[PDB]
Amino acid sequence: PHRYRPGTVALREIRRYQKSTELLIRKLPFQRLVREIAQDFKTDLRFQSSAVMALQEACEAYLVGLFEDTNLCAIHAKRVTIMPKDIQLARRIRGE
Amino acid sequence: KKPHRYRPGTVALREIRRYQKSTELLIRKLPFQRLVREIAQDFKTDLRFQSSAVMALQEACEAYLVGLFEDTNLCAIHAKRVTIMPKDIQLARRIRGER
Amino acid sequence: NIQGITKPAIRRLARRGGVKRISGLIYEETRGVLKVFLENVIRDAVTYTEHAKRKTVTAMDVVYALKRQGRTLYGFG
Amino acid sequence: KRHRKVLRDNIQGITKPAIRRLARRGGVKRISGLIYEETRGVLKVFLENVIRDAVTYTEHAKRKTVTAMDVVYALKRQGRTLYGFGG
Amino acid sequence: KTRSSRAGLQFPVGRVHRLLRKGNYSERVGAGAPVYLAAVLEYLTAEILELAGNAARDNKKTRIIPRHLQLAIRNDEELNKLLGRVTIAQGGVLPNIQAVLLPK
Amino acid sequence: RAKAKTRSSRAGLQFPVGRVHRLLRKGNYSERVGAGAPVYLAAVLEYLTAEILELAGNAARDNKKTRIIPRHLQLAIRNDEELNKLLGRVTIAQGGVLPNIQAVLLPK
Amino acid sequence: SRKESYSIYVYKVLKQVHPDTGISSKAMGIMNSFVNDIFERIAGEASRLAHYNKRSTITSREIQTAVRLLLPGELAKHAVSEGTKAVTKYTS
Amino acid sequence: RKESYSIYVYKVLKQVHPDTGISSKAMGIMNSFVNDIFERIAGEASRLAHYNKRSTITSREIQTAVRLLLPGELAKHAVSEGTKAVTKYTS
């Protein structure tokens, strides 16, 4: 059987997902999470559909930016694998 | 007998303690003023400056640099080094969003 | 419900971020970060809803919340 | 009508020991020789942006003297609010 | 005759004036201020649409879509600076792989 | 005419309600200003002032100083998580920084 | 040349909380900068609140919502408590 | 009802790219953009007026605000367009 080396498919996926723009998290679980979190501030709230889509765009854009910075931090330490300490460094420098 | 000579790093650490305890400005007043006036001259000639304006600018510059060095140090330590290098500064400024 | 943000989804997001190899411990950490972010935004969003004495969070509420945290979003006006 | 000596090479007034002292306040223990030029460049960029904005305010008021308030506003609008120079 | 027509503009000067009057910005509004503002907004709109059209043509599409706007903005240093903290929904990101990740 | 009572006194406050009202009227924030709004605002400003002064006094006594100086204000602000969050982007002139050495730099 | 500041009120509060503590001139200036900063932030946020809801009057309700937006957690709860108590005592 | 800049965006588009269209979402994004820059400029102008104790916002305040917000070449070109427009309008 044929087998691609580790990394080739990863790179293919990088090109694939940087070429397109569709949302990458499933709609319904995301909505469920949003409603659960909202429930802890005020009961019985409802949501307009476009509000949830807006929140999803914001969340995914935020995470993508965080992963770019995380990758730069990983490469700085001459590694290619991102680790939790990389995320924590990135978040400390952003000021969160 | 051999002259007294502390090992590399001792005096650096003592200086860290010393300068974190105090608050006085660390750059000489007059060269800084000349720098400001030179830079200012490339936008409009013959400007004058109030003294307190220059002192304010100096506070801002030194605070900015101090923060940059904190982040630079964290970036250096992340790479398991103890010496800060230019690539550390460039990483810090890239993540802040200035470049 | 935090588990609905699945491992392959986070992998896809990381792919868009250019990440080639990912330690197993990243996923839980990412989830925590996400939760914090969401909380803050939603906390503000519901506040606007409450100020208007409404029970339905609108898209405009979210846009204002995001704007005041310096993360201006285009497309939902 | 007796102007000062034309300003040149003033970036060299930011001496090596001064930058070292600043680094000490930042907790840096060891410093590569190449750090100094980089620091000078960064500082220069920062200064340019601030002074540009300050002078813009000065010109809007049709004044020829940059005031402390001009600087405070310039810094404020760049998200680096400075306390201590009001009034 | 409209003020926009006298000013050679496409953006609605009158509407901008009304929005300034009702935006609680100042007690009075000069006659030239909305003209100037409208001109600036039209110029910037033209710049963004220029670049987005170029990006659309590279992609052999006849309609500008959000993807083209994101590509146009991020590929221009001054626009990218201006919109450094703006998220374009359905914009994606610029194609970009760090050199160290490629083989060899 | 009735004896003059100040609104600050009616509210049990130290901060000047009248002045805050005038600044709201002349700050072009809204066309109209309710009678209760400046009282609330004054109370919040007074409370926050009290909180900062509380921490700064504590710091002053810890340093065996009887007069609060800017150094004490900087120490007070950076050592309190919520104030540090609120003033995350503020520079205190003559404040310095918190004493802090990364553990990896100390000798073994 | 009359320049208003919060100096006398800051001094009264200081005497309430630390009877034997003083303050340098620079620190009082810093306090004035601080007070003006928080004032501007709150008034501006309140203005935006009023604008979003097409109301022409800023009332104590807008102040309260703005306070909840700007201050974190327990600081916000305590400030809200103080404001509410103060307004209710004033109203009577 | 609900105002937008759509028709003006379309006129500009026809000036710069006669054969190019635009999706509904892209037009919405353009409207968000225009409103954003509007708010920024008006707010900066407001602070300018307050700092100088002037009660009138004039074209000069607009110009200074433009110089503060836009970087470099964008600022210069914007100033050029503003000046030409005010000069053509005045006569």
Numbering used by the authors:
A (entry chain A): 38 to 133
B (entry chain E): 36 to 134
C (entry chain B): 25 to 101
D (entry chain F): 16 to 102
E (entry chain G): 15 to 118
F (entry chain C): 11 to 118
G (entry chain D): 32 to 123
H (entry chain H): 33 to 123
The study reports:
Here we report the cryo-electron microscopy structures of human RAD51–nucleosome complexes, in which RAD51 forms ring and filament conformations.
The RAD51 ring forms bind to the nucleosomal DNA and incorporate the linker DNA into the central hole of the ring. The nucleosomal linker DNA that contains the DSB site is recognized by the L1 and L2 loops—active centres that face the central hole of the RAD51 ring. The spatial arrangements of the RAD51 octameric (or nonameric) and decameric rings relative to the nucleosome are distinct. Accordingly, different RAD51 protomers recognize the DNA end by the L1 loops in the central hole of the ring. As compared to the RAD51 filament form, the RAD51 ring binds to the nucleosome without drastic structural changes of the nucleosome, such as DNA peeling from the histones.
